[PDB]
Amino acid sequence: TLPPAWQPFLKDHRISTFKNWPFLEGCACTPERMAEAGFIHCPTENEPDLAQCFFCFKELEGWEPDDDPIEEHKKHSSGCAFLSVKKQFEELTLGEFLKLDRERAKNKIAKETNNKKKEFEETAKKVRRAIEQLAAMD
């Protein structure tokens, strides 16, 4: 019907990921709302309320019932283009859609790159210290 890579652009798909979301009727951050804001549910053992924007890859936990998912996306990743998108999915032109998918691809890379950077810096701190320790023992 539509290729798996592109399904996260669809609100109905995003919604469907919220398998066991705790915040339901009565709350500001319902699945309908989380999905409208671009969030995929992707919980861990560690933080089972974990949610990620499919477009800018910002990850957010510690959700509270009165949290407006849009306000939170705006606050925590103000530069996310998905926020600027006013048209519905079917109303986009292919050029527009393709322009968007490229941005997302670039965002995914930037996220992966920033992760590798932080892990590498961590590995470098361990190595440096170990060598200093040997120099200290000297």
């Binding site: 309320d49 949610a51 990850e59 957010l60 936990e61 925590h76």
Partner: peptide
């Protein structure tokens, strides 16, 4: 809600 721990 807050950013992830890292």
């Amino acid at each position: 809600a807050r950013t992830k721990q890292t």
